[PDB]
């Protein structure tokens with residue numbers, strides 16, 4: 001309907017991060033007669049200028065296009081300076097940090113759930129023929145112990161250690177290259193938020209990948225799941241599963257593990 005939001009309904013709280021345009025805050029959106037809603041608020045430092053402001057607001061319009069359980073939904077915008085983008089809060093924060101500290105509290109079944117949930121989101125985006133370009137555990141947020149979501153697409157934006165070979169060599173970015181990225185993210189999750197190619201330099205990654213080196217099997221990851229990953233890492237983009245195939249396969253792998 002109308003995504004314009006009155007500023008007086010928003011109560012800005014603590015900073016939770018930074019993006020290219022300004023800090024990101026959590027906060028509350030209040031409405032007469034209805035419960036308070038937790039939100040995240042992107043602020044923009046340089047919005048007075050029309051060119052920055054139009055770049056900033058284009059990020060809300062990008063999120064406006066999507067409607068899916070496992071992608072953050074846009075709530076509204078405030079267009080009067082300072083300009084703010086209001087999104088839904090995932091109140092448990094970023095996936096990686098969540099995974100490091102909740103290691104002894106989650107099982108393998110939970111981790112495969114996250115991968116299945118992210119795949120539904122990414123298939124959805126594949127059916128809309130949208131190309132993310134920045135899949136990585138660092139860009140996934142936690143709404144509940146059983147619910148993760150792709151974060152704000154604008155806050156997600158070279159991520160050499162996540163990128164397909166064609167992405168690095170030719171700046172080609174397709175749904176197939178998203179499938180590669182997703183496999184690195186899936187590895188990250190079975191690794192509880194460990195980063196790929198820790199200690200390796202960015203300019204050497206493409207060589208190690210050209211030679212055929214691949215991220216190893218994570219401790220206590222089922223072989224059928226790692227098999228799935230290595231297929232996302234096929235050098236030939238044509239031989240990488242589509243997100244619809246990944247969703248179906250992960251659904252089976254989850255069913256078996258639970």
Ligand SMILES: *CCC(=O)NCCNc1c(NCc2ccc(Nc3ncc(Cl)c(Nc4ccccc4C(=O)NC)n3)cc2)c(=O)c1=O
Pocket residue numbers: 014015016017018023024026040072087088089090091092093094138139140141150151152153155156
């Ligand atoms: C403010 C200064 C600073 O150093 N901040 C870092 C830690 N301060 C802090 C946090 N951070 C934890 C945190 C992160 C995210 C969320 N939830 C949430 N829900 C919805 C959205 Cl759209 C976002 N977006 C977002 C926020 C930050 C970074 C990246 C994104 C994003 O979209 N990435 C793709 N976040 C809750 C808590 C905290 O609680 C602190 O204090």
